[PDB]
Write a protein that binds this ligand. Structure first.
Ligand SMILES: Oc1ncnc2[nH]ccc12
Ligand SMILES: Oc1ncnc2[nH]ccc12
Ligand SMILES: Oc1ncnc2[nH]ccc12
Ligand SMILES: Oc1ncnc2[nH]ccc12
Ligand SMILES: Oc1ncnc2[nH]ccc12
Ligand SMILES: Oc1ncnc2[nH]ccc12
Lengths: 237, 237, 237, 237, 237, 237
């Protein structure tokens, strides 16, 4: 057990899908995994382990923000033998050509957090995904007929940012999505020698207020999860 | 409704107790509040509103880390008329004379987050509690026979810090407890014109590994909550 | 003696009031202290020791700015046995509802100096007063019928700042007064294990640009000093 | 012409390979290009344009360091219609299992420069390559039987760094190679809307301090260049 | 009159010698100037104006630290027509071959203050003296047969520095003397369009622990004053 | 030999003039030196050694930017007994009263590079030239009847700067010329225990948009070289 995960070595697979919302974790388990067992309830951060076409897979919430997800991802790498983390989340878009419900794959993750500076002697750590995991995700998306853009995310510490102008800077430098975790997860993976990827669906445009249905959200969310799970099977080869 | 709180103006009291763990929120509601109703379930971040000796009070989890609690505290101040936030949490100690299960009141909160620098043109914002709320909490503790130390907390972004030496610096400058939120909450309160306090119990010494029972944890936790609730009644006068 | 104080152990009381202006220290001593003898003249930084209602009290100037007051407060603490320092100064106001001749108590002090960053591994140290001294000061003010505002000061390095935009930011985040020392003194008090408090009167509105009459302002200055002296008597119990 | 390139629109291909050494650009041109004409000599920064298997390709030196290569890459992008830049350089190795003559592809590039902080409001910009170009390069290397490592480079300002401790930190966080340009080039490519990639061969071990034979090292250098040229042919489809 | 100088345009000469200690200003006026007339006593920061070999010369203390001297030097320049400031102070040595009583001329001044960073968009401003004034000072020193070093000072905010290692770094980079003002005066000079020079006398050695001794303070102090005053005369011609 | 200079101890004189352009080094060797002998061609960074009025003098390009010139200047100092570096370059003007073809002497150099911050524990290092060398240069300029300004340069990392406002700040603070090297050369000089000076010729105006024109480049360029060379002679005597 660790302070935030009441479980032992072997309860988690070597690969873990992590939505922000732990309710979405329970939904992943019942919708995609066979023979699923609950492996964590500490703080209501529900975690499960089952199989997807024979492959052992886990899914657990990480919570909003770099500090929350850094706790869970670290404990998984160092205490539960986890080799790969796939964040499966939502993000807001700043580019007019990036559309609602697009799948975005974060090869890199910008941030305004200080966590990587603390790690990297106050220099610029390029918070990057594992390259094979990125390609695996792109190829799985192609096989599912989903076109996916690959590029930079921005991991914000403040959802309610007092710096509105920063969104224009993000746009100028090609940021595909604004979320709150990738740069933290990528930092942890590098620190403790594991691999990570963040995939997000665009749920918001910080531009116009445009609408989606609940049905449209479920279908797009299911597509991201399919992408992530099929990406794992490609990574196994 | 707000993106993280499915509720309307009036569902929350003007004062909100916030543990990190949403399971502890449900426990506060059933143990201390009368006539309690559920007011939030979004992302399993359970929130309740009831009364404590006639006084309308709310309790809801905020999640681990500055970014999580900044979401909820902001939305409460700006969309639900919340005037006071009391964080009710745990912390780790670095001072040998600060003992396990001590009640610590954060008049101020140091941090290694960058959130207040983003707010404060990269200068030093002294993240402080509302003074009356601090005194209210000290006086409530005295009336309950609990001695409480008042001073600085340290709100860490990394629970698993790669900078071990920083704990000695904290100790040298008198930091009473290490937690992950106060400086973020104090920042939000100042930004949006409300009041905040963080009270923590010492659950850990980053020094020796010393033990407590589950019974000892419940009693100390109940004492912190009593302190916080009685502090509100003193603040009403 | 120390490099800036030609005096000996015992020559100061264990509490020292500190205006910025040494001529103001002489003013405090002659007006409020009995049997007052001068105990320092090095660099014209006049220090005095006498009694207030039978309690031994010292008063001494600290000069303008964090670097000047850091020198004096340090030497008093480590070489002259001083346990409490009460800065008694002036500040400019930034909030419209903060009026001329309001008494302001700095529970915290923001700053643009980097002294506390030097001390605190480049993180945010929340420069705070000792809580008991704050409370003693508030109660002493209550007993004299004076309505003390407790909150954040801002300790500036540049009285003539090139960046006028920073005053709006101070206003936004609730800064009660702008002065030049508090954050420095609080850093010293935490570094060397003593206690400190800054009281200020508002002598300036960096908003409306106005006065106020000489007799009324000098009355309020005397009230601040009475609050300081009476607060130490409350601290003795 | 631009201030550092005496040539005209059309004189360069829409892809430019860029070694640091202009004499190396002449080497690339004569060895791998047919019908190669020199298109720039200003400051001795030799640029050439020819064909590789019927595809128009240019090659030109960029000089040592982020500031030098930022100038050339910018001018190519905004004035000579260049859409892709492939840096083909050398790096020093930091990881023990990264060997001499390994081909390294910088999906990302860390840095100690502050150029990207100037661009990105002092936050962390993740300096990344274009994903497709990375994949093209990996596939081209696979087709030639070469085992390319994909990950982080570190773009240093000081070849002779005063801070030897930073090399351990690079090792800890998985940096594959240390060079002087990639982060600069990736910043330019994002600023001005083009695409970039850095390939390096490991010519140095800042760990074991060793060689390796002249024929074998020049063989591996030629393989890097073949990978670069073949990757652009894959990019055309 | 200005907020810290009770005097009128004309009361000061167009060059002002400024020691930190106002009692040294007094001493200088008495010992070196004819017809010496006190032009300021606000805050005991004594200012004088008299004559040196017929040349109108002023001398006023500036207090300890960048914030103190930045106030006075500014007010002199904007409201009293002062064109040249010459700081005449003391410093601590860090180089072993710089010995006690040596005269150092601050061609530049390093600092750990944030003031120049505030002025210069967080970039490195090279805080420099006026060249002609430096040359004037060197020629006056030669003419009086006094040895004089020219180079960098370091203007510290913390006399009692908690970072002992920093002195090794100053040593490494050739710092002739540690004082508390020059970098601020040179910043003010540039900001407000005047000229300045800091000359210092090496009091103690930061390493060795021994301060200015017997009558040797006075002659060495007088040598600096002589240089400064003679340097003004050369500047006129 | 060093990694970027293929030559032996003795091949270089103890002072080296360095333009950015290696073809200017060639031109200088041809036009000003007798018995001129090429001592380096590694990376086309041409180095020469000959005679000026019997004095052994070397001249070598350093490439564009702090990182490029930091490599060469270091290697010259540590492995070829070079005592003095004189950068002889071009700069852009920011002050309207600084006109095209003006000769500027870099007494100090501001910068937006992080290199000196890396060397100086993130504090402000005042990057200065050697005083005697500055004086030598001014006296040689007077003797040749050439006007010469003495003050601060600004060493930029981005020729194509995305921060246009910064030029206003340079203007405000008296920056005589914008170039890309001086602050790095002065840092290297201090780090490795040699002396340096940067002299520049004002090519364009950053505001006005017009570069060095017709034969006036050559005479103005030759005036700088003449000053530099004559300045060496004065330094010997
Ligand atoms: O995390 C986020 N930050 C900003 N905007 C957003 N939209 C969806 C997630 C999101
Ligand atoms: O939040 C925290 N960070 C570090 N140590 C701790 N102990 C308990 C909470 C805690
Ligand atoms: O620094 C300051 N800025 C404006 N007004 C003030 N009063 C006292 C200090 C002060
Ligand atoms: O900057 C660098 N440091 C060490 N080795 C290297 N090789 C290439 C650049 C480089
Ligand atoms: O200002 C100073 N800081 C440190 N040591 C010193 N000696 C003399 C002045 C001085
Ligand atoms: O280096 C430079 N940066 C900006 N403008 C310039 N003109 C000439 C050199 C120069």
């Amino acid at each position: 057990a660790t302070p935030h995960i009441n479980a032992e070595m072997g309860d988690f697979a070597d690969v873990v899908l992590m939505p922000g919302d732990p309710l979405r974790a329970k939904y992943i388990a019942e919708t995609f995994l066979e023979d699923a067992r609950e492996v964590n309830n500490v703080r209501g951060m529900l975690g499960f382990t089952g199989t997807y076409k024979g492959r052992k897979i886990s899914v657990m919430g990480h919570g909003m923000g770099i500090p929350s997800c850094s706790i869970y991802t670290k404990e998984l790498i160092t205490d539960f033998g986890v080799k790969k983390i796939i964040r499966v989340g939502s993000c807001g878009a700043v580019l007019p050509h990036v559309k609602l419900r697009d799948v975005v794959i974060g090869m890199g993750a910008c941030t305004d957090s200080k966590v990587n500076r603390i790690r990297f002697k106050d220099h610029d750590f390029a918070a990057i995904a594992d390259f094979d995991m990125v390609r695996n995700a792109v190829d799985a998306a192609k096989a599912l007929g989903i076109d996916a853009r690959v590029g930079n995310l921005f991991s914000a510490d403040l959802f309610y940012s007092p710096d509105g102008e920063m969104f224009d800077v993000m746009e100028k430098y090609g940021i595909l999505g604004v979320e709150m975790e990738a740069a933290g997860i990528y930092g942890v993976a590098a620190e403790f020698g594991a691999k990570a990827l963040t995939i997000c669906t665009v749920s918001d445009h910080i531009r116009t207020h445009e609408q989606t249905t609940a049905a449209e959200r479920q279908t797009t969310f299911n597509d991201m999860i399919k992408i992530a799970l099929e990406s794992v099977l490609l990574g196994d080869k």
